[PDB]
Design an enzyme around this catalytic site. Structure first.
Site, PDB file in Angstrom:
ATOM      1  N   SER A   1       0.834  -1.361   0.143  1.00  0.00           N
ATOM      2  CA  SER A   1      -0.090   0.097  -0.125  1.00  0.00           C
ATOM      3  C   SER A   1       0.898   1.120   0.055  1.00  0.00           C
ATOM      4  O   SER A   1       1.930   1.315   0.263  1.00  0.00           O
ATOM      5  CB  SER A   1      -0.799  -0.046   1.106  1.00  0.00           C
TER       6      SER A   1
ATOM      7  N   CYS B   1       1.855  -0.263 -12.789  1.00  0.00           N
ATOM      8  CA  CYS B   1       2.753   0.737 -12.113  1.00  0.00           C
ATOM      9  C   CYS B   1       2.606   2.022 -13.228  1.00  0.00           C
ATOM     10  O   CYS B   1       2.169   3.055 -12.710  1.00  0.00           O
ATOM     11  CB  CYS B   1       4.068   0.370 -11.954  1.00  0.00           C
TER      12      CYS B   1
HETATM   13  C1  LIG Z   1      -4.628  -6.000  -0.776  1.00  0.00           C
HETATM   14  S1  LIG Z   1      -4.136  -5.216   0.823  1.00  0.00           S
HETATM   15  C2  LIG Z   1      -2.360  -4.529   0.750  1.00  0.00           C
HETATM   16  C3  LIG Z   1      -1.442  -5.341   1.989  1.00  0.00           C
HETATM   17  C4  LIG Z   1      -1.589  -4.231   3.281  1.00  0.00           C
HETATM   18  N1  LIG Z   1      -2.699  -3.519   3.193  1.00  0.00           N
HETATM   19  C5  LIG Z   1      -0.222  -3.416   3.481  1.00  0.00           C
HETATM   20  O1  LIG Z   1      -0.387  -2.396   3.249  1.00  0.00           O
HETATM   21  O2  LIG Z   1       0.788  -4.204   3.694  1.00  0.00           O
HETATM   22  C6  LIG Z   1      -4.326  -6.492   2.031  1.00  0.00           C
HETATM   23  C7  LIG Z   1      -3.649  -7.683   2.343  1.00  0.00           C
HETATM   24  O3  LIG Z   1      -4.567  -8.424   3.127  1.00  0.00           O
HETATM   25  C8  LIG Z   1      -4.946  -9.597   2.634  1.00  0.00           C
HETATM   26  N2  LIG Z   1      -6.275  -9.661   2.326  1.00  0.00           N
HETATM   27  C9  LIG Z   1      -7.085  -9.104   1.377  1.00  0.00           C
HETATM   28  N3  LIG Z   1      -8.451  -9.321   1.568  1.00  0.00           N
HETATM   29  C10 LIG Z   1      -8.508 -10.182   2.520  1.00  0.00           C
HETATM   30  C11 LIG Z   1      -9.515 -10.659   3.069  1.00  0.00           C
HETATM   31  N4  LIG Z   1     -10.702 -10.676   2.628  1.00  0.00           N
HETATM   32  N5  LIG Z   1      -9.434 -11.518   4.390  1.00  0.00           N
HETATM   33  C12 LIG Z   1      -8.047 -11.762   4.815  1.00  0.00           C
HETATM   34  N6  LIG Z   1      -6.842 -11.097   4.195  1.00  0.00           N
HETATM   35  C13 LIG Z   1      -7.343 -10.339   3.302  1.00  0.00           C
HETATM   36  C14 LIG Z   1      -4.113  -9.886   1.375  1.00  0.00           C
HETATM   37  O4  LIG Z   1      -3.558 -11.114   1.354  1.00  0.00           O
HETATM   38  C15 LIG Z   1      -3.191  -8.423   1.020  1.00  0.00           C
HETATM   39  O5  LIG Z   1      -1.803  -8.716   0.822  1.00  0.00           O
END
Ligand SMILES: C[S@+](CC[C@H](N)C(=O)[O-])C[C@H]1O[C@@H](n2cnc3c(N)ncnc32)[C@H](O)[C@@H]1O
Ligand SMILES: C[S@+](CC[C@H](N)C(=O)[O-])C[C@H]1O[C@@H](n2cnc3c(N)ncnc32)[C@H](O)[C@@H]1O
Lengths: 322, 335
Positions: A64, A297
């Site tokens: 993020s 990107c």
């Molecule tokens: C797409 S985001 C970006 C990563 C995180 N927000 C960060 O800033 O490091 C959230 C992360 O949580 C996990 N995630 C996404 N949707 C989820 C869900 N419904 N339940 C559990 N984990 C989830 C994914 O594996 C993803 O890497």
């Protein structure tokens, strides 16, 4: 690259005339019919190789954005400034239970845990590997501080409540903002707060669905219909949570982030080809996952740079219970 | 401030006023608009949290005159002009219907009206649906009695008017529906207001709210530079010009069910209509006023104020084709 920047400034301008309307009555109304629509959806729709991210994302593997203070802010550094902002704006305190929703690779879970050794920090992800990797760092740097539940956020129940709930880059995958904010609120403590960050447009929300028949973009990048939220949109899902504070950051911070992600990718490309052929079993397919990430990107660092960051942007909302 | 002095003696044209009011509007729009959305948002949010520590509210016109200036309902709030050739009377009636529809009024409900005024909305609702018991709430003695005499004129054992200040009204009655039309503009601390009113909403009740606002930023009425005649001439006595969106941040005791805006064209046109009927009877308002106030000069003084007030706001609401100053309507459910 060059033409793709162009093929995306045109997608931008036609998403821009799509959602802009000539009076405030029409604008506001469109956004309020949009939110009501997402109450007719489910809470959310129903795996990247770790070597590759040590290259593209930087030290903490924060999937993020980050706060860039000037354009000499390293990508590494931006990741740090952003998450102190998080910590500052969430009023985090030494010793409080912390739940971190969608840890990813734990860049925030480990940050809070190290910056505040009194806090018991609990993370949640649906990836076995993210969990194990994270708990590998705890090992390395001496953290009896962390915990990683493995569960899909949209399914998880619990009796446990939490002084501060985090939820960054997570709303981007949720359809019904209502059921989401409904569930998370029963995880909020007597006097606790919930920190939501989320990509958005300044002015209108929308589905990820073709503008023309000639806009490759919504098909190539998004492939499922997500929602690009509206900056103000969460003000209309305040039934179980109340807005305490609300901030936004200019779209230059993502734009720069994407800019960092593309250069390191392109600086280490031979190693990138090698990691993705091992993993996808083909030079053709690797040569096409490279393409995706570059296009993602390029396009999106151009999408967010729009109008010096005053179109798409980051939005931060702080919440309290009931 | 000798400006005001000659303003009263008729020396200053209606277009100087409209002229000075245009420069007022330009100053207020330069002050309030930030160049990044991050700043604009934090203008409002800080101003919004600012209100949370104030008092709810800080601590009378002749009837022949409102009868003249206003419509036959005496709505002291804005009307709805489908068209420029809509009349004051219809503009009123169009607007209250709009209300009666956006607040999901059905026959039978109990209706609490806050700041009923001379009763335009109370009586509208009461004649239209004999099934409702409507309670009005004003603090004016004249206003209670007037409505109570129009209730005799219209024969409606359908209305109730309590004489009390809303700011200090204490009750344990709940009403299926509650209006607060052009009232929040007397208030500052909407949190403590919206909390008081929220105890008056019954199970699945609905509250409906209208307020003048600017589209974007909010602000106290304090003078911009020291070339600001309008501020302390028009207002006593710091009131607060709300933002369109500002009541999305006051959602601790009530939830939002919908939210609309209407162009500043409607309030622009009404005020224009207010001026004409006032000026098509200046001598009758002079008599009415030279009789009421005790001297021909405060007559002069108060007739001037209202021509000024009708001309500035009508100019102010017309800025940028009705898209700076504006009307915000919001419908709430009991959180
Ligand atoms: C797409 S985001 C970006 C990563 C995180 N927000 C960060 O800033 O490091 C959230 C992360 O949580 C996990 N995630 C996404 N949707 C989820 C869900 N419904 N339940 C559990 N984990 C989830 C994914 O594996 C993803 O890497
Ligand atoms: C023009 S508005 C509302 C009435 C308008 N006729 C309508 O229903 O559209 C302003 C009204 O606020 C009311 N008001 C302001 N502060 C008040 C208070 N503290 N208690 C009761 N009424 C108040 C006044 O009586 C005034 O008529």
């Amino acid at each position: 690259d060059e033409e793709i920047r162009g093929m995306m400034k045109i997608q931008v301008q036609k998403r821009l005339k799509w959602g802009y309307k000539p009076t405030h009555e029409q604008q506001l109304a469109q956004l309020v019919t949009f939110a009501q629509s997402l109450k007719g959806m489910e809470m959310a729709e129903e795996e990247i190789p770790l070597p590759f991210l040590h290259i593209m994302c930087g030290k903490t593997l924060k999937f993020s954005p980050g706060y860039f203070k000037d354009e000499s802010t390293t990508l590494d550094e931006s990741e740090v400034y952003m998450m102190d902002l998080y910590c500052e704006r969430a009023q985090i305190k030494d010793g409080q239970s912390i739940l971190d929703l969608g840890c990813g690779h734990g860049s925030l879970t480990l940050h809070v845990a190290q910056k505040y050794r009194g806090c018991k920090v609990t993370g949640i992800t649906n990836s076995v590997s993210q969990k194990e990797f994270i708990m590998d760092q705890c090992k390395k740097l001496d953290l009896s501080n962390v915990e990683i539940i493995l569960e899909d956020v949209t399914k998880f129940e619990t009796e446990i409540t939490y002084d501060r709930i985090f939820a960054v880059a997570l709303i981007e995958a949720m359809k019904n903002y209502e059921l989401f904010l409904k569930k998370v609120s029963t995880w909020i403590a007597q006097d606790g707060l919930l920190f939501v960050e989320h990509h958005c447009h300044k002015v209108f929300a929308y589905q990820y669905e073709p503008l023309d028949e000639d806009d490759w973009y919504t098909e190539y990048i998004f492939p499922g219909t997500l929602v690009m939220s509206s900056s103000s949109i969460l003000l209309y899902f305040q039934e179980d949570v109340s807005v305490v504070n609300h901030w936004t950051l200019s779209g230059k911070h993502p734009s720069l982030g994407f800019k960092q992600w593309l250069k390191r990718l392109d600086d280490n490309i031979d190693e990138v080809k090698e990691i993705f052929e091992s993993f996808y079993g083909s030079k053709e397919k690797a040569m096409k996952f490279i393409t995706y990430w570059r296009v993602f990107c390029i396009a999106h660092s151009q999408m967010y740079s729009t109008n010096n960051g005053e179109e798409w942007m980051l939005s931060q909302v702080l919440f309290k219970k009931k």
